[PDB]
Amino acid sequence: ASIDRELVPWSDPEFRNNPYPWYRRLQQDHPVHKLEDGTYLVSRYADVSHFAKLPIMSVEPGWADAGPWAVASDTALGSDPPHHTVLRRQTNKWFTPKLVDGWVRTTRELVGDLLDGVEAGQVIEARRDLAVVPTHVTMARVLQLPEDDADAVMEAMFEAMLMQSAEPADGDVDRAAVAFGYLSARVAEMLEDKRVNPGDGLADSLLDAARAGEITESEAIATILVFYAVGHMAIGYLIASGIELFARRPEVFTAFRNDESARAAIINEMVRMDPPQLSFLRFPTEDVEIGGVLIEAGSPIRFMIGAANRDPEVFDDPDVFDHTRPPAASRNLSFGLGPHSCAGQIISRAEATTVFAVLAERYERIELAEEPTVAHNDFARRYRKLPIVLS
Ligand code: HEM
């Protein structure tokens, strides 16, 4: 209780900015820690790896209770197998590598356009203009939905994410209700337009799957809304994080420039050191013993991704950025694992590669024009602004 505040002060500004020193104590001394409220924190790589992916780990109860976020219950994120596999089939077939090569053409075009527009030495707000809008429009093009709402989409997800903290402030649930009301209204308008003017994008595919009985109508519309809303979000964070990293560690940007074959490794090390999603929940459908601690069926288990990605039992010098870590020790948990591993992962890596590549094509050096403005919490990392100058 006061023990919980010492290990994981979820609301503390310092913990929120950089929890990683606290994660060490957790992982070393309290690897399976039961909080006050009943949630077990699981922070060792081995335990996250082995346990989070088990068939007994249900994703159902938390999202079903999540108020405004219950929309996730009608997607892969909040649905267990067997139906999980069928929801995932609906979108996986849209995001094979060859399909993704074509989708990220949009990413490349928009980045090139932005960069063509600038004057030498001009301050670029990299979070909106190189991260959020390119990825938002990329996904909207795949869906075949209108492309022009990135800014209000991003504000809405900013508001919807507040209640995902382990310690929501008063009113954060209400703010999420407002956010999801907006996204629902926008999706409803866009789908009425699509009934009268159908396309052949991922949104038309999902609607057809619901008409064909493969998924429900609610599941089609919830999947549309989620992919449309989050297309910019965690991927927008990874892009901005990598840009900041290129700026504070220019030898990394130079390596990315000089060595095409290192690119996937560099992006994967960025992803390891700064996951945008710091945990997820699971609800075991039967008792399970982890680290010698018996967790009862139904108890919340919060698997700590960020903490696990610095496990020194797996990663030597875990707080050191090193893109040369060997294949035997370069697997991180930032995209999850098991059947729920991120449904955006192949397009995410390709979008981040595209933006960094365009930058690499045109410049030698990234600098921060001022300190970045961030809005992190215990659950998700987030930039508000990332002013840069390219040379
Ligand atoms: C850097 C980018 C991203 C990271 C680091 C990330 C992280 C994650 C994590 C940690 C999970 C597992 C959640 C859990 O198991 O409860 C997840 C799942 C998911 N993500 Fe991503 N995410 C990213 C980008 C995206 C994008 C662009 C999309 C839009 C397609 C997306 C859509 C999803 C969906 C639908 C799931 C649920 C998959 C399932 O339950 O089978 N993500 N993501």
mmCIF file of C-alpha atoms and ligand atoms in Angstrom, residues 52 59 63 72 75-79 84-85 87-88 91-92 95 135 139 202 223 226-239 271 274-282 305 332-345 347-349 351-352 379, ligand 1:
data_model
loop_
_atom_site.group_PDB
_atom_site.id
_atom_site.type_symbol
_atom_site.label_atom_id
_atom_site.label_comp_id
_atom_site.label_asym_id
_atom_site.label_seq_id
_atom_site.Cartn_x
_atom_site.Cartn_y
_atom_site.Cartn_z
ATOM 1 C CA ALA A 52 1.728 -13.809 -20.895
ATOM 2 C CA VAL A 59 -8.054 -10.772 -22.553
ATOM 3 C CA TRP A 63 -11.779 -4.613 -21.752
ATOM 4 C CA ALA A 72 -11.994 -3.157 -27.665
ATOM 5 C CA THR A 75 -11.821 -6.474 -31.583
ATOM 6 C CA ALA A 76 -8.949 -8.951 -31.488
ATOM 7 C CA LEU A 77 -7.489 -6.958 -28.510
ATOM 8 C CA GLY A 78 -10.411 -7.966 -26.217
ATOM 9 C CA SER A 79 -11.416 -11.338 -27.655
ATOM 10 C CA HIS A 84 -9.748 -14.228 -31.899
ATOM 11 C CA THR A 85 -8.139 -16.106 -34.819
ATOM 12 C CA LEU A 87 -10.868 -11.418 -36.132
ATOM 13 C CA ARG A 88 -7.122 -11.492 -36.698
ATOM 14 C CA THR A 91 -6.750 -7.776 -40.859
ATOM 15 C CA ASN A 92 -3.581 -9.975 -41.088
ATOM 16 C CA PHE A 95 -0.619 -6.569 -43.841
ATOM 17 C CA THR A 135 1.190 7.273 -40.302
ATOM 18 C CA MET A 139 -3.603 3.731 -42.414
ATOM 19 C CA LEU A 202 -9.808 -2.781 -45.380
ATOM 20 C CA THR A 223 -12.019 -3.065 -35.732
ATOM 21 C CA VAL A 226 -9.499 0.989 -33.649
ATOM 22 C CA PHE A 227 -7.262 0.620 -36.703
ATOM 23 C CA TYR A 228 -8.375 4.092 -37.928
ATOM 24 C CA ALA A 229 -7.822 5.727 -34.485
ATOM 25 C CA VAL A 230 -4.526 4.067 -33.502
ATOM 26 C CA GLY A 231 -2.913 4.080 -36.997
ATOM 27 C CA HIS A 232 -0.886 7.150 -35.918
ATOM 28 C CA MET A 233 -0.428 6.436 -32.261
ATOM 29 C CA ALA A 234 2.188 3.938 -30.859
ATOM 30 C CA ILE A 235 3.934 4.079 -34.317
ATOM 31 C CA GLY A 236 3.910 7.900 -34.131
ATOM 32 C CA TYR A 237 5.626 7.562 -30.740
ATOM 33 C CA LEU A 238 8.355 5.104 -32.050
ATOM 34 C CA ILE A 239 9.136 7.413 -35.018
ATOM 35 C CA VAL A 271 11.767 -0.343 -29.912
ATOM 36 C CA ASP A 274 11.535 2.859 -25.538
ATOM 37 C CA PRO A 275 8.367 0.793 -25.917
ATOM 38 C CA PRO A 276 5.363 3.194 -26.253
ATOM 39 C CA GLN A 277 3.145 0.718 -24.337
ATOM 40 C CA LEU A 278 4.660 -0.183 -20.987
ATOM 41 C CA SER A 279 2.356 -3.077 -19.973
ATOM 42 C CA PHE A 280 -0.756 -5.053 -20.706
ATOM 43 C CA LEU A 281 -3.276 -7.043 -18.672
ATOM 44 C CA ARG A 282 -4.317 -10.631 -18.680
ATOM 45 C CA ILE A 305 7.032 -4.835 -21.075
ATOM 46 C CA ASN A 332 12.132 -7.538 -27.202
ATOM 47 C CA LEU A 333 8.525 -7.580 -25.952
ATOM 48 C CA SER A 334 7.483 -4.119 -27.208
ATOM 49 C CA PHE A 335 4.967 -5.588 -29.702
ATOM 50 C CA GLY A 336 3.649 -8.212 -27.224
ATOM 51 C CA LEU A 337 3.813 -11.974 -27.829
ATOM 52 C CA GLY A 338 1.550 -14.986 -28.334
ATOM 53 C CA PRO A 339 -1.732 -14.763 -30.277
ATOM 54 C CA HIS A 340 -2.211 -11.063 -29.338
ATOM 55 C CA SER A 341 1.132 -9.844 -30.555
ATOM 56 C CA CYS A 342 0.599 -6.534 -32.233
ATOM 57 C CA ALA A 343 -1.719 -6.582 -35.247
ATOM 58 C CA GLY A 344 0.242 -3.471 -36.543
ATOM 59 C CA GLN A 345 3.720 -4.800 -36.193
ATOM 60 C CA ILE A 347 3.366 -2.025 -41.005
ATOM 61 C CA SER A 348 4.819 -0.257 -37.986
ATOM 62 C CA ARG A 349 8.392 -1.413 -38.597
ATOM 63 C CA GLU A 351 6.635 2.906 -41.557
ATOM 64 C CA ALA A 352 9.390 3.667 -39.118
ATOM 65 C CA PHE A 379 1.014 3.093 -19.226
HETATM 66 C C1 HEM B 1 5.356 1.023 -32.668
HETATM 67 C C2 HEM B 1 4.117 0.598 -32.896
HETATM 68 C C3 HEM B 1 3.311 -0.324 -31.948
HETATM 69 C C4 HEM B 1 3.668 -0.925 -30.797
HETATM 70 C C5 HEM B 1 5.116 -0.731 -30.213
HETATM 71 C C6 HEM B 1 2.468 -1.680 -30.350
HETATM 72 C C7 HEM B 1 2.260 -2.444 -29.221
HETATM 73 C C8 HEM B 1 1.293 -3.385 -29.046
HETATM 74 C C9 HEM B 1 1.255 -4.288 -27.909
HETATM 75 C C10 HEM B 1 2.343 -4.248 -26.759
HETATM 76 C C11 HEM B 1 0.247 -5.125 -28.138
HETATM 77 C C12 HEM B 1 -0.248 -6.274 -27.239
HETATM 78 C C13 HEM B 1 -1.369 -5.798 -26.324
HETATM 79 C C14 HEM B 1 -1.835 -6.999 -25.475
HETATM 80 O O1 HEM B 1 -1.329 -8.145 -25.703
HETATM 81 O O2 HEM B 1 -2.789 -6.800 -24.657
HETATM 82 C C15 HEM B 1 -0.474 -4.667 -29.334
HETATM 83 C C16 HEM B 1 -1.565 -5.195 -29.953
HETATM 84 C C17 HEM B 1 -2.290 -4.669 -30.982
HETATM 85 N N1 HEM B 1 -1.929 -3.587 -31.794
HETATM 86 FE FE1 HEM B 1 -0.121 -2.646 -31.706
HETATM 87 N N2 HEM B 1 1.463 -1.502 -31.241
HETATM 88 C C18 HEM B 1 1.942 -0.653 -32.262
HETATM 89 C C19 HEM B 1 1.360 -0.212 -33.435
HETATM 90 C C20 HEM B 1 0.105 -0.528 -33.940
HETATM 91 C C21 HEM B 1 -0.635 -0.027 -35.102
HETATM 92 C C22 HEM B 1 -0.174 0.965 -36.221
HETATM 93 C C23 HEM B 1 -1.794 -0.664 -35.138
HETATM 94 C C24 HEM B 1 -2.927 -0.503 -36.183
HETATM 95 C C25 HEM B 1 -2.932 -1.569 -36.936
HETATM 96 C C26 HEM B 1 -1.854 -1.552 -34.025
HETATM 97 C C27 HEM B 1 -2.903 -2.349 -33.700
HETATM 98 C C28 HEM B 1 -2.931 -3.340 -32.730
HETATM 99 C C29 HEM B 1 -4.024 -4.297 -32.550
HETATM 100 C C30 HEM B 1 -5.376 -4.447 -33.308
HETATM 101 C C31 HEM B 1 -3.590 -5.192 -31.413
HETATM 102 C C32 HEM B 1 -4.396 -6.373 -30.809
HETATM 103 C C33 HEM B 1 -3.806 -7.605 -31.541
HETATM 104 C C34 HEM B 1 -4.449 -8.865 -30.948
HETATM 105 O O3 HEM B 1 -5.075 -8.765 -29.841
HETATM 106 O O4 HEM B 1 -4.385 -9.923 -31.581
HETATM 107 N N3 HEM B 1 -0.687 -1.407 -33.321
HETATM 108 N N4 HEM B 1 0.198 -3.646 -29.854
#
